[PDB]
Amino acid sequence: GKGKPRGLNSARKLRVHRRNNRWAENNYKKRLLGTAFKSSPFGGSSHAKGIVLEKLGIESKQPNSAIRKCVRVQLIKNGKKVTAFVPNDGCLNFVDENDEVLLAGFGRKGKAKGDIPGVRFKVVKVSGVSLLALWKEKKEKPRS
C-alpha cells in the first residue's frame, strides 16, 4: 500500500526519488541554478547604488487613480537600467538628474507592490543623506 517501497534494503530508491521531486519547489530551484547571479539587477545584494537619468510619473492601476512619482536609474556596477519609486510626496523635489541614489527592494521579493505597475525598488538615500531625515527637516542637502 501507499505506493512507495517499504523494504529494509530500499534506501537507494527512496533518496533518489526525493531528489527528483525537490525541483518542483520554487525557492529550492532558484538556489541550485544560481538564478540571482545570472539575472536580476542587484546581483544578489540587498542594496545597490545608481545614477538618476530622468524623472517620471506612473499612472496607477485601476480602480485606483493617481499619478505616482518615479525615476529611471542606471546601476553603477552593472549598467543595467531600472525604475524606482520615491516615497513621501514632496520628496521628489530633493532628487534631480545625475544625483547618486541608494536603492532598496520594495519588500515583496521581486514582485511589484500595490498599485504601481512594474516598479520593484524604492529610493533610500540621495547624495549621501537619507530621505527620511530630509522629509522631517532634520538635515540639509548640498547641491552639486
Partner 1 sequence: TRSSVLADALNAINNAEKTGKRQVLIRPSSKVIIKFLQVMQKHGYIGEFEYIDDHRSGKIVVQLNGRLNKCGVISPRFNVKIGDIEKWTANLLPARQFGYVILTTSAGIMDHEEARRKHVSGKILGFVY
Partner RNA sequence: GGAUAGUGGCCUACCAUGGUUUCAACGGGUAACGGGGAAUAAGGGUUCGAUUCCGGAGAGGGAGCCUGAGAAACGGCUACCA
Partner RNA sequence: CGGUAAUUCCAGCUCCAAUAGCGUAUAUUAAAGUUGUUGCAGUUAAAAAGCUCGUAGUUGAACUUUGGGCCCGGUUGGCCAACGGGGCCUUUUUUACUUUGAAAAAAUUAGAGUGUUCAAAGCAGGCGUGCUCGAAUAUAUUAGCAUGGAAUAAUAGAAUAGGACGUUUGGUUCUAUUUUUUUCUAGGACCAUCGUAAUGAUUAAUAGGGACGGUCGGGGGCAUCAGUAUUCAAUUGUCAGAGGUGAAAUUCUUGGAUUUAUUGAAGACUAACUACUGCGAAAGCAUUUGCCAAGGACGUUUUCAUUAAUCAAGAACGAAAGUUAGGGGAUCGAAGAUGAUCAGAUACCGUCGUAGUCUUAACCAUAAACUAUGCCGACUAGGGAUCGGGUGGUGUUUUUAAUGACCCACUCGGCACCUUACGAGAAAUCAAAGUCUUUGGGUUCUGGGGGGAGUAUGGUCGCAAGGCUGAAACUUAAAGGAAUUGAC
Binding stretches for RNA (CB under 7 A): 1-10, 12-14, 18, 21-22, 24-27, 29-31, 34-40, 44-47, 64-66, 104-112, 117-118
**Residue 20 in grid coordinates:** 527528483
In the complex with RNA, which residue's Cβ is closer, 64 or 97?
64
Binding site for partner 1 (CB under 8 A): 6-8
Q: Which does 31 bind (CB under 5 to 8 A by kind): RNA, partner 1, none?
A: RNA
**CA angle (75 as vertex; 71, 76 as ends), nearest 5:** 135
In the complex with RNA, which residue's Cβ is closer, 36 or 129?
36
Please state the closest distance from residue 52 (CB atom) to RNA, in A.
Answer: 19
Q: Which does 107 bind (CB under 5 to 8 A by kind): partner 1, RNA, none?
A: RNA
The maximal CA–CA distance of the chain, rounded, in angstroms, is 75
List, in order, residues 6 or more apart from 10 with CB less than 8 Å away.
Answer: none
DSSP E strands: which ranges in 1-144?
47-59, 67-75, 81-85, 100-105, 121-126, 129-130
